[PDB]
Ligand binder design. Structure first.
Ligand SMILES: CCCCCCCCO[C@@H]1O[C@H](CO)[C@@H](O)[C@H](O)[C@H]1O
Lengths: 48, 149
């Protein structure tokens, strides 16, 4: 009912590893850029 | 430019305005001004310079006579070295949409007097140069940026 079976799972393996590795890398890169806005500090200094 | 330093060298000595704070000027005491002159206005750190129709020798004489500093210890004769200033890639945005025009300044850390590269850097700065509303040159100025401008 499904000859692929074996290959389908070998792929699923490769998928998890790359998926693991990649989600990580990109999570950093996303935080990296955003830091500029995350750390950002603002103050309201109306004139007197 | 103050704001530029203020953030470019943030956290250090260079990040301060020359005029100083408001609280300082409101409270600075006779003592401090005195102590400032005392600690900083010292012979080894001064330089009497002059140019025009004058005799180097006569000048040096007048000096020996009125610039009569007395140095006993090594302290007095030493020229202090200042604690380094850290450059920080950052920004400071002071917004007020009510002002007529906007001012923007962008910079990278420079080498400092000593380095020979300063020459090249000035040559570089000449290629880009500067411009402003009243230059007659106009669309023909050699500075690419001035043209586009
Ligand atoms: C974002 C996740 C991407 C996962 C990419 C995995 C690529 C699948 O890799 C596949 O593996 C099979 C068996 O090893 C081979 O027979 C296929 O030719 C190969 O393309």
């Amino acid at each position: 009912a499904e000859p692929e079976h074996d290959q389908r799972k070998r792929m699923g393996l490769k998928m998890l590893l790359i998926s693991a590795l990649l989600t990580s890398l990109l999570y950093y890169m996303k935080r990296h850029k955003w830091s500029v806005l995350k750390s950002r500090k603002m103050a309201y200094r109306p004139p007197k | 430019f103050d704001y530029l330093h203020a953030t470019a060298f943030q956290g250090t000595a260079l990040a301060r305005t020359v005029e100083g704070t408001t609280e300082n000027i409101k409270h600075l005491t006779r003592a401090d001004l005195a102590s400032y002159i005392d600690t900083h206005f010292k012979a080894p750190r001064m330089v009497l310079a002059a140019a025009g129709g004058i005799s180097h020798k006569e000048l040096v004489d007048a000096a020996r006579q009125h610039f009569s500093g007395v140095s006993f210890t090594y302290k007095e004769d030493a020229v202090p070295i200042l604690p380094r200033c850290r450059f920080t890639g950052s920004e400071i945005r002071a917004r007020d949409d009510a002002l007529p025009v906007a001012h923007v300044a962008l910079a990278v850390e420079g080498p400092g007097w000593a380095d020979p590269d300063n020459v090249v850097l000035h040559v570089a700065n000449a290629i880009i140069g500067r411009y402003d509303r009243t230059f007659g040159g106009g669309k023909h100025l050699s500075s690419r940026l001035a043209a586009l401008a």
